Enzyme design. Structure first.
Site, PDB file in Angstrom:
ATOM      1  CG  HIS A  14      -6.934  53.916  77.259  1.00  0.00           C
ATOM      2  ND1 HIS A  14      -6.465  53.982  78.550  1.00  0.00           N
ATOM      3  CD2 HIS A  14      -6.189  52.971  76.637  1.00  0.00           C
ATOM      4  CE1 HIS A  14      -5.471  53.126  78.703  1.00  0.00           C
ATOM      5  NE2 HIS A  14      -5.285  52.500  77.557  1.00  0.00           N
ATOM      6  CE  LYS A  41      -4.174  48.956  81.319  1.00  0.00           C
ATOM      7  NZ  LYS A  41      -3.821  50.347  81.688  1.00  0.00           N
ATOM      8  CG  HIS A 115       0.164  53.085  73.392  1.00  0.00           C
ATOM      9  ND1 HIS A 115       0.230  52.109  74.361  1.00  0.00           N
ATOM     10  CD2 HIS A 115       1.083  54.018  73.734  1.00  0.00           C
ATOM     11  CE1 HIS A 115       1.141  52.443  75.259  1.00  0.00           C
ATOM     12  NE2 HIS A 115       1.678  53.594  74.898  1.00  0.00           N
TER      13      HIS A 115
END
Length: 122
Positions: A14, A41, A115
């Site tokens: 990310h 993904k 996350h």
């Protein structure tokens, strides 16, 4: 010793400090580089800019509590969302890129992001 492996995985999945293009081809290449193409993904967002601002989401300096045990940033970030197209979950993985600029939602542990909540980019 803390286990902060999920922070380094968060960066792999990310974070891209200095992206350049942020077009479809950018997404197709970075998704491969970061190991996110086996299987493809469906959606994945990269945050750009400096790391310290992202870590700061985990404290009052750049974040607020959000929903159930998440945190939302006070600053906006340059981001790029890569959305899979084509019906196959397997490579080659074609992606459409959408650049954006807004705050982000993460979960934190040990003061580090572990996350990214993808829902705000769907």
């Amino acid at each position: 010793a803390q286990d902060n492996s999920r922070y380094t995985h968060f960066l792999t999945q990310h974070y891209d400090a200095k992206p350049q293009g942020r077009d479809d081809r950018y997404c197709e290449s970075i998704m491969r580089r970061r190991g996110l193409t086996s299987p493809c993904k469906d959606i994945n967002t990269f945050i750009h800019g400096n790391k310290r601002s992202i870590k700061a989401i985990c404290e009052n300096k750049n974040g607020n509590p959000h929903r159930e045990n998440l945190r939302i940033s006070k600053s906006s970030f340059q981001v790029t969302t890569c959305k899979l197209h084509g019906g196959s979950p397997w490579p080659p993985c074609q992606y459409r890129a959408t650049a954006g600029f807004r705050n982000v939602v993460v979960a934190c542990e040990n003061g580090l992001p572990v996350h990214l909540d993808q829902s705000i980019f769907r």
